[PDB]
Every structure is written in C-alpha cells, then in structure tokens.
Amino acid sequence: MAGPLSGLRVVELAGIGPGPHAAMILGDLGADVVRIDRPSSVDGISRDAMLRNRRIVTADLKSDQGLELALKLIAKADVLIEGYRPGVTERLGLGPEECAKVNDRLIYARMTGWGQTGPRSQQAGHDINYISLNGILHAIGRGDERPVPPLNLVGDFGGGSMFLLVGILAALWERQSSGKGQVVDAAMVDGSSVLIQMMWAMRATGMWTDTRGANMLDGGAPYYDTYECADGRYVAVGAIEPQFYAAMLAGLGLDAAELPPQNDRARWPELRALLTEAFASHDRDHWGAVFANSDACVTPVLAFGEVHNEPHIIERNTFYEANGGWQPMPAPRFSRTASSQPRPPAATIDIEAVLTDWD
Amino acid sequence: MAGPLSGLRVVELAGIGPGPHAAMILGDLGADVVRIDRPSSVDGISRDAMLRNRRIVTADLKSDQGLELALKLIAKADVLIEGYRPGVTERLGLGPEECAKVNDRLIYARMTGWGQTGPRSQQAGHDINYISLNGILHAIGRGDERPVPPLNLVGDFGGGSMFLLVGILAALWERQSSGKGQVVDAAMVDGSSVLIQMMWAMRATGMWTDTRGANMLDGGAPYYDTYECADGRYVAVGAIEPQFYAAMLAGLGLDAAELPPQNDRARWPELRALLTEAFASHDRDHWGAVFANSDACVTPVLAFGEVHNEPHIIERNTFYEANGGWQPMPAPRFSRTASSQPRPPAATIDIEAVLTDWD
Ligand SMILES: C[C@H](C(=O)SCCNC(=O)CCNC(=O)[C@H](O)C(C)(C)COP(=O)(O)OP(=O)(O)OC[C@H]1O[C@@H](n2cnc3c(N)ncnc32)[C@H](O)[C@@H]1OP(=O)(O)O)c1ccc(-c2ccccc2)c(F)c1
Numbered sequence: 281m282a283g284p285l286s287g288l289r290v291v292e293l294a295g296i297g298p299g300p301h302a303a304m305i306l307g308d309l310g311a312d313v314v315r316i317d318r319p320s321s322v323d324g325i326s327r328d329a330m331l332r333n334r335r336i337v338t339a340d341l342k343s344d345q346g347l348e349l350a351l352k353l354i355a356k357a358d359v360l361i362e363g364y365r366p367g368v369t370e371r372l373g374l375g376p377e378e379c380a381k382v383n384d385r386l387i388y389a390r391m392t393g394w395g396q397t398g399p400r401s402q403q404a405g406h407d408i409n410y411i412s413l414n415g416i417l418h419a420i421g422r423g424d425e426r427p428v429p430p431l432n433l434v435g436d437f438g439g440g441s442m443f444l445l446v447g448i449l450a451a452l453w454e455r456q457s458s459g460k461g462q463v464v465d466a467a468m469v470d471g472s473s474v475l476i477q478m479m480w481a482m483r484a485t486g487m488w489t490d491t492r493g494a495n496m497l498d499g500g501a502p503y504y505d506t507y508e509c510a511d512g513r514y515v516a517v518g519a520i521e522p523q524f525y526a527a528m529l530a531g532l533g534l535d536a537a538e539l540p541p542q543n544d545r546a547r548w549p550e551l552r553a554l555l556t557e558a559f560a561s562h563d564r565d566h567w568g569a570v571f572a573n574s575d576a577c578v579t580p581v582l583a584f585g586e587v588h589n590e591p592h593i594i595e596r597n598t599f600y601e602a603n604g605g606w607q608p609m610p611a612p613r614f615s616r617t618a619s620s621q622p623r624p625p626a627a628t629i630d631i632e633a634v635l636t637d638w639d
Numbered sequence: 640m641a642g643p644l645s646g647l648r649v650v651e652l653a654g655i656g657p658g659p660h661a662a663m664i665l666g667d668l669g670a671d672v673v674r675i676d677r678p679s680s681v682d683g684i685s686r687d688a689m690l691r692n693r694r695i696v697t698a699d700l701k702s703d704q705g706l707e708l709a710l711k712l713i714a715k716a717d718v719l720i721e722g723y724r725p726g727v728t729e730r731l732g733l734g735p736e737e738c739a740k741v742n743d744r745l746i747y748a749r750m751t752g753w754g755q756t757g758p759r760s761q762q763a764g765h766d767i768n769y770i771s772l773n774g775i776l777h778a779i780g781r782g783d784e785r786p787v788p789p790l791n792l793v794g795d796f797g798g799g800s801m802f803l804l805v806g807i808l809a810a811l812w813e814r815q816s817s818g819k820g821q822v823v824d825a826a827m828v829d830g831s832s833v834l835i836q837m838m839w840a841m842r843a844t845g846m847w848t849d850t851r852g853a854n855m856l857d858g859g860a861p862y863y864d865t866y867e868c869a870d871g872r873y874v875a876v877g878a879i880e881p882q883f884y885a886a887m888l889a890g891l892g893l894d895a896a897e898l899p900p901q902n903d904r905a906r907w908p909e910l911r912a913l914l915t916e917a918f919a920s921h922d923r924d925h926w927g928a929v930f931a932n933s934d935a936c937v938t939p940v941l942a943f944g945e946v947h948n949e950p951h952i953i954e955r956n957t958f959y960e961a962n963g964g965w966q967p968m969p970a971p972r973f974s975r976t977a978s979s980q981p982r983p984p985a986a987t988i989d990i991e992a993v994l995t996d997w998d
C-alpha cells in the first residue's frame with residue numbers, strides 16, 4: 281500500500297460526513313482502513329466515491345458476537361474513528377474506556393459537531409447548524425440578503441474532518457514518546473472557529489466588522505469579488521496587492537487617473553460601477569486569455585463540468601476518472617512516498633478474513 | 640510546552656494566509672515554532688493574533704549571514720514551512736536539496752495555491768482565484784446572482800493550511816519507520832478539491848448539478864438554508880433527515896399534510912414561501928428557545944460579537960479572552976496531552992538565543 285501512512289491501521293464506525301472524509305484521506309495516503317457498517321444497510325458495491333480506499337465489513341454491533349468481533353479489530357489497530365452522538369459507543373460497549381482495556385495504544389477519534397459535553401451535545405445538527413453558532417455563517421453572503429451556506433465545506437470538512445486528521449496524526453506523534461494512545465475530541469464548532477482565526481484576529485484590530493458584504497474578503501471590496509462578463513459567465517478578482525491591482529486595471533483598459541483610489545472605501549460604489557462596466561464588456565474567455573500568466577489575480581470561475589478541460593488542472597493531475605465522473609486525487613503530495621490512485625469501493629468482506637490478514 | 644506535539648521543532652519562513660495558519664496550529668498543539676521574518680517588517684510586537692505560539696526572529700535571507708543562521712535553525716528542526724512562489728527558496732539557498740544536506744530528516748513543507756509546477760505556477764493569486772479554477776466558487780451563492788466568496792476559508796485554510804498539516808504529520812509518521820524526511824507539496828487548488836470530494840461523489844451519481852442554488856446543501860433546499868425572522872435576524876435550518884424535518888414542522892406550527900413533499904424539488908419554491916412566512920412570524924431568540932433540546936436542526940445565526948454570550952460556547956471554552964477581544968482556543972482536544980491557552984506573539988527575540996536554546 282503506497283503513501284506516507286503505509287502500515288497505519290484504522291477502524292471506522294460508519295457514520296456520515298466528516299467521519300468518512302477523514303477516513304477517506306487516511307486511506308488516500310496509504311493507511312489500512314476498515315469500515316464497520318451495520319448490516320441493515322449495505323446492499324451491493326457502494327456508489328459513494330467517498331468510501332474509496334476502504335475495506336467494508338458488515339457487523340450488528342447490537343449482538344454480543346458483533347461487539348466482540350468489533351473489539352478484536354480495535355485491539356489490532358492504531359486508530360478508531362466514530363462520529364455518533366456522545367454516549368453511543370459507550371452504550372454499545374465500544375467506548376474509550378472499553379477500548380483502553382484491549383489496546384492502550386489506540387487513538388480514539390471522536391467526530392462531533394457540538395462536542396462531547398454541554399447543552400447542545402445531544403442535539404442533531406449539520407454543517408449549517410454548527411457554523412451558525414460561532415459567527416461564521418453570519419459572515420457569508422451579500423449584505424442586502426440573508427446569509428448563504430458555503431456548502432458543507434467549512435463545518436464538515438474544513439473544520440471537522442481535517443481537525444480530526446490533525447488530532448489523530450498529532451496523537452500518533454505523541455504515542456512515539458509515551459507509548460500510549462489517547463482520546464481525540466474533534467468538534468466542528470471548535471475546528472471551524474480555528475479555521476476562521478484570521479477574522480477573529482482582524483476583528484480585534486478594527487480590520488473586520490460584523491456587517492456582511494462590507495469587508496476585504498467577503499465580497500465588499502471591489503478588488504476581491506466576482507464579476508459578471510458579457511456572456512453571463514464570471515471571473516474572480518483577487519487583486520489585493522497594489523501592484524496586482526495596477527496590472528488588472530491596465531488589462532481592463534482603465535486609467536488609474538479616472539478611478540477612485542483602490543482603498544478609498546467611501547468611493548467603492550463608484551469603483552465597483554467602473555469595474556462592473558469594464559468586465560461586462562467582454563466574455564469570460566476573453567478575460568481568461570488577456571490575463572493568463574499575469575499577476576492581475578483574475579481567473580475564470582469554472583463550473584465543475586468544465587474543470588477537466590483547464591490546462592493547469594490537467595497537467596498536475598488534480599483529478600482522475602472513475603465511473604462516469606472525475607474525482608480529486610489525494611492531497612497533499614509527497615516527494616518520496618507518493619500516494620497512488622485511490623482504489624474504488626470494495627465489495628464487502630468477512631470480519632474474520634480481516635482478523636486473519638491482520639497478524 | 641503542553642500538547643501532543645511537545646518538542647516538535649518547526650521553522651516557519653514568514654508569509655501570509657495558509658503557511659502562518661498551519662504554523663499556528665502546530666504551535667497551538669505544543670510545537671516549538673520559530674518564525675523567520677525579514678528585518679524591514681517587524682516594528683513593535685506584531686498585532687496579528689495568528690502569530691501566537693511562536694518565537695519571531697529577523698534575518699535578511701539574502702545576506703550571507705542571514706542565510707547561514709537560517710540553515711543552522713533548519714539543521715536542528717523537524718519541519719520547515721515555506722509559502723512562497725516556487726523557485727523562491729531555491730534562489731535563497733534554502734531549497735529542499737540545500738536543506739537535505741544539513742538534515743536528511745527534515746520535513747519540507749511547501750504551501751502554494753497553484754502547486755510547484757505547471758502553467759499557473761508562477762501566477763500571483765489569492766484564495767478566491769484558487770477556488771475559481773476547480774468548480775468550488777461557482778457553486779456558492781444564490782442562483783439569480785453572481786458567486787459569493789466564502790471568505791477565504793476554503794482555499795487558504797480548509798483546502799490549504801489543513802492539508803499542509805495533514806502532510807507534515809503524515810510525513811513525520813512515515814519518518815518513524817524510514818529515518819528520512821521528504822517534501823510535502825500542498826497546493827490549495829488540490830486540497831480544496833479533496834475538501835469538496837462529497838460534491839464530486841454526488842455529481843457522479845446524478846445527485847448534484849452545476850446550477851447554483853439548486854442542490855441539497857448549497858441553499859436551494861428549503862430545509863437546508865437560513866431564514867429571516869421577525870426582528871431581521873436569522874436562523875439556520877439543517878433538517879435533512881425526514882424525522883428532524885418533521886420535528887421542525889411541528890415546532891413551526893405547520894401541518895405536514897398542507898405542505899408539498901420535503902424533497903419534491905419542483906415545489907421547493909412553494910415550500911420555502913410557507914416556511915419563510917412561519918419563521919418571519921417570531922424573532923430569532925424565540926426560535927432558539929422553542930428548538931433547544933430538539934432534533935429539529937434549527938439554530939440561531941449569531942454574529943461574531945454575540946458568540947461570547949452563547950451557553951454552549953461559554954461552557955466548552957471554545958474561545959478565550961485576549962488583547963482586543965475573543966479568539967478560538969486550540970482544536971481538536973486531547974484527553975491525556977491537552978493543549979494550553981495560546982501565548983501571545985513573542986516580541987522579536989534574537990536568532991542566536993534560539994540556537995543556544997536548541998543545543
Ligand atoms: C451536511 C451533512 C452533515 O453535516 S453530516 C454531519 C452530521 N453531524 C454529525 O455527524 C455530528 C455527530 N453525529 C450526530 O449528531 C448524529 O450521528 C446524527 C447524524 C445527527 C443523527 O443520527 P442518529 O440517526 O440519531 O444516530 P446516532 O449517532 O445518535 O446513533 C446511531 C445509532 O446507530 C446504532 N449503530 C451504529 N452502528 C451500528 C451497527 N453496526 N449495528 C447496529 N447499530 C449500530 C447506534 O447504536 C445508535 O442507535 P441508538 O442510540 O438508537 O440505540 C450531510 C453530509 C453527507 C450526507 C450524505 C450524502 C450522500 C449520501 C449519504 C449521506 C448527508 F446526508 C448529510
């Protein structure tokens with residue numbers, strides 16, 4: 281098995297969202313990932329490409345057979361991932377304390393939104409709920425309209441799975457000294473807060489307000505936003521640095537002497553109007569050619585369906601093909617122990633065959 | 640120094656956005672982090688709380704002495720972080736190959752947007768550009784309107800710093816059974832593509848389209864979006880599961896029989912108008928009360944300035960007071976080797992002291 285996480289052994293109690301995203305990445309980078317699903321689901325070879333780099337096993341954890349078999353895998357493994365409400369693994373008998381008695385080396389990785397304790401710890405929820413509570417959602421969208429969710433990028437993955445991964449991998453580094461595993465409490469409401477630490481920093485020094493659509497990076501600056509082109513398609517402008525902004529103006533055919541200053545906020549209405557008219561006068565692909573190889577920080581806003589035809593995407597193999605759809609190649613990349621193409625989801629396996637192979 | 644990464648040694652070449660964020664989290668979790676800035680920059684004590692859990696040192700890396708000193712740090716350290724355009728560290732004489740001469744154990748962590756090679760590798764950019772190229776930005780915002788940047792959470796941090804971190808720590812694990820460092824190439828256009836893997840999975844199986852504002856999680860579903868309340872503040876609804884959905888309807892006072900099906904997409908506009916009217920009839924805090932302890936997946940949308948007054952936030956100490964105002968405490972959390980409250984930015988110490996301190 282290729283990649284820097286070769287040899288690493290992982291048990292994943294099937295959940296949804298962050299939990300599997302974490303497990304995917306571990307798999308992506310070489311880990312040996314065993315996913316225990318309930319039998320009352322699972323029905324053929326799985327259609328979710330998120331379950332790549334996986335051995336799947338069926339096992340009723342309610343039965344005593346299930347519990348014990350599960351408990352054998354955990355013994356022989358480096359990491360457990362579960363993303364159920366607090367108390368669930370306990371009441372199954374797969375809790376931390378039960379695991380620490382068949383394997384004090386275990387990294388016990390707990391993926392929630394709200395955390396292991398406190399008032400909301402038992403409430404159901406999704407990405408949008410966790411980011412609603414910590415100020416993040418309120419900051420996303422245009423100022424005249426209600427917040428718009430940034431898909432489930434910021435809560436599930438960015439501030440969820442990714443911190444689960446860091447916690448796991450930081451705990452493995454710790455286990456090189458002490459010789460003992462530990463419990464990783466990854467909560468989306470907390471990870472996503474660290475994810476947005478920049479804004480908390482800027483907020484402190486007067487450089488970010490709570491007004492949506494009126495900051496440097498939320499779309500309120502005319503030089504950090506998208507623009508509609510002649511064809512109804514869009515470009516992105518991120519020309520924050522004055523040298524890049526100048527390069528942009530020259531490409532647009534606008535003379536700096538006719539525009540307000542870039543950072544005179546009181547005149548952002550005029551500036552935006554000027555730039556809006558400029559970008560609207562030609563189509564996206566025009567602006568794409570004009571600015572390629574430029575530091576003007578203008579790029580086409582591609583739809584998923586067009587990503588596969590973008591040269592820079594093609595040449596770095598950011599994507600690969602797999603069953604009438606492209607999928608991202610693993611990330612990040614490693615010089616010596618490179619990852620492989622992910623293996624597609626693998627038809628179920630007996631939990632016995634695995635306990636054998638593991639020896 | 641408290642945390643799972645106690646006595647991990649990290650050298651950070653000063654940049655902006657992802658590189659500093661990754662360095663922060665390493666700090667956050669105990670690591671020994673020395674940030675080499677350029678002498679022209681530092682005035683007093685840097686007011687960016689992202690520069691917490693660091694020692695700051697100056698050094699003209701273009702002088703002969705500045706270089707020599709920096710290579711002496713790197714020789715002693717475990718990880719180097721640089722976030723410059725490709726070729727830049729090579730020309731300073733801090734390239735991977737130069738660093739491998741003085742320390743074949745070093746984890747060499749390169750944080751870019753576009754990657755190390757390819758047609759856009761020398762192009763300036765920011766978050767909004769990296770996510771324009773790979774389908775992500777196109778997918779965010781309302782349908783009748785131009786795409787909206789999700790601040791810089793998805794390229795810089797979610798798809799950026801966090802993948803640098805996963806790569807640094809995965810490579811430390813690999814070192815444990817090889818004796819050798821290696822180069823981690825973390826490109827925001829890659830990380831952010833993996834971060835959004837779920838959408839790519841979903842489009843493969845016909846469950847996501849490239850139309851903005853028309854999907855389960857982009858704000859087009861009436862049970863996954865925000866709603867304006869009577870006082871002009873907002874709630875978030877995330878009631879995907881039919882049971883959570885049904886719970887929400889009952890708390891709204893809405894009879895399931897009068898409404899269109901939850902997932903009849905042709906009738907979503909009609910469903911949203913009924914839900915809109917219901918949520919508009921009371922204020923945000925009213926709904927927060929009504930749905931507490933509920934599985935209805937309905938939460939207040941708090942602005943940054945209100946987050947310190949939220950019970951669930953206060954009681955789990957997700958934030959700590961400092962300086963101007965609040966900041967996020969470390970994530971994720973660890974049972975045995977717990978992180979400590981971040982130390983503010985450490986006024987410029989001199990590089991020789993650090994070398995004494997490290998042997
Ligand atoms: C965008 C969106 C996301 O944001 S995903 C993130 C959602 N939040 C979390 O993940 C945080 C923590 N977890 C939870 O809050 C709960 O997990 C749920 C999901 C709320 C409720 O689930 P629940 O149905 O109440 O389940 P519980 O966790 O409370 O308990 C589970 C029950 O199952 C039993 N058992 C587990 N394994 C077995 C087994 N092998 N055999 C037998 N029983 C088993 C437990 O014992 C327990 O039973 P009980 O307590 O009743 O006794 C999102 C993202 C992606 C998708 C998606 C997309 C495409 C395809 C599929 C999914 C999505 F739909 C939503």
Ligand SMILES: C[C@H](C(=O)SCCNC(=O)CCNC(=O)[C@H](O)C(C)(C)COP(=O)(O)OP(=O)(O)OC[C@H]1O[C@@H](n2cnc3c(N)ncnc32)[C@H](O)[C@@H]1OP(=O)(O)O)c1ccc(-c2ccccc2)c(F)c1
Pocket residue numbers: 497520653654655656657675676677678698699700701722723724727730731750751752753762763764765766767791795
């Ligand atoms: C939302 C937004 C973000 O997305 S942050 C992410 C921006 N993207 C990246 O990070 C991708 C990789 N990097 C680059 O693409 C380039 O780094 C830039 C940034 C385009 C600048 O181009 P540049 O100014 O040309 O710099 P280069 O990388 O080309 O080279 C730097 C030169 O400096 C020299 N030297 C470095 N260290 C030293 C030293 N110690 N002593 C002497 N010289 C040094 C190098 O030698 C090199 O020299 P050269 O080869 O040119 O002669 C974002 C987020 C946050 C902020 C923000 C917010 C508040 C306050 C401040 C910033 C923001 F503005 C934007």
